[PDB]
Design a protein around this nucleic acid. Structure first.
Lengths: 50, 91, 77, 112, 151, 50
RNA sequence: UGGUAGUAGCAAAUAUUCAAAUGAGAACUUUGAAGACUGAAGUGGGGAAAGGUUCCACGUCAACAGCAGUUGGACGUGGGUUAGUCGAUCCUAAGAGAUGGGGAAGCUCCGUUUCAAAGGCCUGAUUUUAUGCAGGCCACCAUCGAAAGGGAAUCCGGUUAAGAUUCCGGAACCUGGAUAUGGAUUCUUCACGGUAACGUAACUGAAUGUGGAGACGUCGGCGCGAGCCCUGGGAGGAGUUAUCUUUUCUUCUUAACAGCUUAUCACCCCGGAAUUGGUUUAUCCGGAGAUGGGGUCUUAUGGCUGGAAGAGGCCAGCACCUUUGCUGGCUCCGGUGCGCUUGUGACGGCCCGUGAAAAUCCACAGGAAGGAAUAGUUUUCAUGCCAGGUCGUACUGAUAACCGCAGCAGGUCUCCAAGGUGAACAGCCUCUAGUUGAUAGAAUAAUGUAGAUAAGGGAAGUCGGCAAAAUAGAUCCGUAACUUCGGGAUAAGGAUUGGCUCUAAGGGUCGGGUAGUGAGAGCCUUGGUCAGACGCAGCGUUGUAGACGGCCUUGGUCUUGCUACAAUUAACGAUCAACUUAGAACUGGUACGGACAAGGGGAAUCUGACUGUCUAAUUAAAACAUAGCAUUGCGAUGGUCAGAAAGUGAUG
């Protein structure tokens, strides 16, 4: 941490690209129940445990 | 002067440890920290480290000896026994 | 990184076919305690180190500037 | 004063991580990491450092010419001179004394 | 962790050209540069190592083998020694006296080095403080301090 | 080093050097001036015994 | 979902104020002006562990920031981490763990060099031979395990909204591989010099062996070096000026690398010692050869030069809607040290503690093999050429970025380190740096918490002087019983302590002559000789300076050979930095360790000898430990103990 292996950084890359809200166009789509993103992992609330 | 009356070097221990024990440790530190004659170079330069080891300061030698003195009294007789025993092989 | 005292060694270096760049630097320093005078430094770039030549008397320096081969690219100051 | 920092990423005061403080041409104090000090080669027999040998770290000795690693005697960069002198004297005199051991037993074995 | 000092005696390998270094327990009074003679016909001087069938009785040897070739079992700690008190040349046995005062008959092909063991009189000095016993037992094993089982 | 340079100037011989050196190793000399006075004292004594 | 209740409360960390800007709206945002704080064992600069985007920018104010909000470690959208040299990679440590084997119904257990036929290395065979075969050797015997141990290699300056020992400019070095050009050697084929210690840019060398480096505790003082601190002269810029002050602050810097040179230590040669002598703060050395004289060596260091002033720094001018500068200067000469920190050299103390290993690299012994000159050898000499892969790199490292459910007065390893007082890294105040954040306003009742101060008496309070008070720094005097003779002891108990003007002591560096002479190895100067050259200036012109100087000199030009006189005596004269100690007057509303800091002591008893250790969240003790004493078992086909077993295991 500040000096890392590669595997942990690869999972941080995935944890970055998932840390975003819904696309705005899905809420218009037919038969939609998804109203927000129920998996927003912040860094002040949830530690991902690698 | 003579700064201590009867403790000597064991005055570094102080008031602790009894009197007979400090007298007993004195008896062996006067042998241990002393400076002995080297039998080969003839110089009084033998000091010890590392109990049982007597390194000459000059002359590079090292005598494995007694732990506090260069050759203890129960050892220096043994070689005289050897001096008795090796003479009977020839005569 | 090196310093050269000889002149003919420097002339041997300027024709060594790796030396593509040289430069002439003109310093303004003072002799023994009194007077300002003109020092020059000839720096040839060998491919490993940068050789120099320190000339204090400029009466050798004008002859030496003339004595450089003209195929050598010279940065003047 | 100007308080300085480590340059590498090792924060502890180990034997590898030593620091000199140097003024740099920008005027500022800055740290310089200093390699451990090289030790002189020693005689294997008398323990004295033997002279004529450049004192370098052990992989520096492959960057150097052979005359900074050697003196011009037999047993040059390995043993100090006196010991070499002694192992000539001894190695002469016994190989004279042994010849005495070959001249006594030509006569004592013959006069028996 | 050992009261006696060692002795790194170096021998010539008889079958390949090299030197083999061997760690004896130093007897008392072996200066460095002493030639140490291992073997049957070796003379009887302080530091030589000999078979027990080659020495006379009353000889004060140490580092003596139990069975011939286990390389130094009996009488190794500092100050100690065994004393050959008799021979039995029939079926080549030797009767010795161990440091505890137990007499014992062993084989006369076992090897003992002549002389008492260097470092003698090590426990005649008091160990005055607890820290000195700590620094004694930090180099042997974890057997200190001993809590009483009544406590 | 004052005894050293007085010997190197030849003002004092080496016998009195080896006496006054071991005396200076004790107290025997409160300062520089007392030692100069003690040099001149013993030198005048050996001069009167000459 | 209530009553409770719009109450308990949002009070530790000395602390905020004024004006302007944005805005619907500023106790809280931004700038400026004040005022303070941490005060360099910092509320400062970097990091390890940990977090993972929080770093940085634009926009937004629903929710969160237990008040506020136009602000944010929030929300929305994007941007950002560049390495041959930093680390990981490689090595082994305590240890883990295959293979061979041995158990176990089996999951799996033991063991790690072991009851195992456990593999590669260079030369020859080549011109079927592709690189197999004929040998000569050698035997170690997996693998993992330390981004704090071992280790091949870099630094400076600049640069971005966020990266830099990584990018850019310059300057280097290491490893691996190629081949040439020189130089060296050679018909004395595989170098010479030095009495020697050893030196030279080079100066064959296999298998095998040996040695060195890697390789190393801790404490103490001494020497040297670096950086900081302090200080003098000089060259700039700012502040103060009612008065005074040659004033107060600030800038004046130099890297990696390379060449030459040098300091202890060590060694060689001549030489010979007692009328014992060298010599350290610390007492060790010398006929196993001192002191003395002359040398050799190492180079962390230091110095000079190159890098490199063309860099950075501090100023000045001419300007410039803006872009962007351009032109100039200077950047110099020193000194001190029980100073602070740090590195090291030689020592000295300590031990029934004597204080890692391997990789890697080098050297020597050895002599296989190969090599001459019409030229073969030489890449551990100079130069040149080519290449250096992968992964990490942003930021915080904490009274908001980690863990404690939280933006929790807790907890978490380390480096740097300023001025004054002062013994001090104590407390107290300031500089560089960073903050000004911890809901506010008004009053200031009871009872609280935190700090105080009290007439007279003095523990009479109380289970008990519990809590406070009192002493306390330094200097000088004086110090009992008892004792293991070391202590007890800062025992007890007294006396001083400012400011000012002085006095005495405590140290260094060079000079030890007059006269006649040589070189005054300064040669000045008058004269030139011709390198009299660089460069300036002007319409090769034919003017400028000759660097105002190698070279030749008629001498007035404070270092001296040789002797004269006789040189020698008291040992001096000049001169410069340190502070320490002792005393005297004089003076102050009798004060003066003026704040801070900072022992109460004695007479005894019970108990444990002591230093130490534990019930982390009620027990820190007379308990546990301890050294000391004593006992018991055991001679390894063993004593104590483990295992479900084993061709097992701990002490070992």
């Amino acid at each position: 941490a500040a000096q890392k292996s590669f595997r942990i950084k690869q999972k941080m890359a995935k944890a970055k690209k998932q840390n975003r809200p819904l696309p705005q166009w899905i809420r218009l789509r037919t038969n939609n129940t998804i109203r927000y993103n129920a998996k927003r992992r912040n860094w002040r609330r949830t530690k991902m445990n690698i | 002067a003579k700064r201590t009356k009867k403790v000597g070097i064991t005055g570094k221990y102080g008031v602790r440890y009894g009197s007979s024990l400090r007298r007993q440790v004195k008896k062996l530190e006067i042998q241990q920290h002393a400076r002995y004659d080297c039998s080969f170079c003839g110089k009084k330069t033998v000091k010890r480290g590392a109990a049982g080891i007597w390194t000459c300061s000059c002359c590079k030698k090292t005598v494995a000896g007694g732990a506090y003195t260069v050759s203890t009294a129960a050892a220096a007789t043994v070689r005289s026994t050897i001096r008795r025993l090796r003479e009977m092989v020839e005569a | 990184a090196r310093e050269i005292t000889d002149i003919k060694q420097f002339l041997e270096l300027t024709r060594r076919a790796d030396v593509k760049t040289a430069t002439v630097k003109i310093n303004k320093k003072l002799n023994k305690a009194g007077k300002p005078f003109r020092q020059t430094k000839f720096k040839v770039r060998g491919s490993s180190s940068l050789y120099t030549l320190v000339i204090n008397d400029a009466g050798k320096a004008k002859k030496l500037i003339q004595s450089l081969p003209p195929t050598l690219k010279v940065n003047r100051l | 004063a100007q308080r300085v920092t480590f340059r590498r990423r090792n924060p502890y005061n180990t034997r590898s991580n030593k620091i000199k403080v140097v003024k740099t041409p920008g005027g500022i104090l800055r740290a310089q990491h200093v390699k451990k000090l090289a030790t002189r080669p020693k005689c294997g027999d008398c323990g004295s450092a033997l002279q004529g040998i450049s004192t370098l770290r052990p992989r520096q000795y492959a960057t150097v010419s052979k005359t900074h690693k050697t003196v011009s005697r037999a047993y040059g960069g390995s043993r100090c001179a006196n010991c070499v002198k002694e192992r000539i004297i001894r190695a002469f005199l016994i190989e004279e004394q042994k010849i005495v051991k070959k001249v006594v037993k030509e006569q004592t074995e013959a006069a028996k | 962790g050992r009261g006696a000092p060692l002795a790194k005696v170096v021998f010539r390998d008889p079958y390949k050209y090299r030197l083999r270094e061997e760690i004896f327990i130093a007897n008392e009074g072996v200066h460095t540069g002493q030639f140490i003679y291992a073997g049957k016909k070796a003379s009887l001087n302080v530091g030589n190592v000999l078979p027990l069938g080659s020495v006379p009785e009353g000889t004060i040897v140490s580092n003596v083998e139990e069975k011939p070739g286990d390389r130094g079992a009996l009488a190794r700690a500092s100050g100690n020694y065994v004393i050959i008190i008799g021979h039995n040349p029939d079926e080549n046995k030797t009767r010795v006296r161990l440091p505890s005062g137990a007499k014992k008959v062993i084989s006369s092909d076992a090897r003992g080095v002549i002389g008492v063991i260097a470092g003698g009189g090590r426990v005649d000095k008091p160990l005055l403080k607890a820290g000195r016993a700590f620094h004694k037992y930090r180099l042997k094993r974890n057997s200190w301090p001993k809590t009483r089982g009544v406590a | 080093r004052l005894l050293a340079k007085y010997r190197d100037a030849g003002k004092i011989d080496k016998h009195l050097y080896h006496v006054l050196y071991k005396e200076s190793k004790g107290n025997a000399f409160k300062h520089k001036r007392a030692l100069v006075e003690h040099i001149i004292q013993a030198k005048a004594d050996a001069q009167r015994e000459k």
